[model samples]
Target: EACKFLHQERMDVCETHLHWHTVAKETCSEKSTNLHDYGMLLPCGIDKFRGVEFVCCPL
Candidate 1:
């Protein structure tokens, strides 16, 4: 399955489901479109140029 974007407080699976995606502008929300792809990462809050930020959490 494609690594997906999950909330920091997401299910308890995040403990290991760690995933990420390239975003624009960061903030976990680039295009209300909700579509990202690029050697990205998860759990970030802006500051990435090659990519933005994503959110994912494990219980």
Candidate 2:
């Protein structure tokens, strides 16, 4: 899955946003109109140009 790939691979800002975009498409409700409306299981946030800031947590 896209999320798993993102978690494993070296993801930049754009790829991170893409990952979330895919997730939002699959999981977000039809009524949900924004990223804030969707609950994210991963550690991420919105950045400039509507991009995503994916935080890499050390395990």
Residue 20 in candidate 2, Cα distance off native in Å: 0.2
Clashing pairs in 1: 14-58, 15-58, 20-41
Model 2 Cα lDDT, one tens digit per residue, 1-59? 12211222234543454566555544333323322333233444553123322322222
Where model 1 places Cα greater than 4 Å from the true spot, the runs are 1-31, 41-59
Total residue pair clashes for candidate 2 = 0
Please report, as a residue range, the 10-residue window in candidate 2 with the lowest summed lDDT.
1-10
Residue 8, candidate 1: Cα error in Å is 15
- What lDDT is reached at residue 32 by model 2? 34
Candidate 1 lDDT over residue span 1-59, tens digit each = 33345332332322222232322313234323334433343433343222233432221
Provide C-alpha RMSD values for all models, in order: 13.0, 11.3
Give the range of the ten consecutive residues with the poorest summed lDDT in model 1. 9-18
Instruction: For each candidate in the order shown, give its overall lDDT on alpha carbons.
Output: 0.33, 0.36
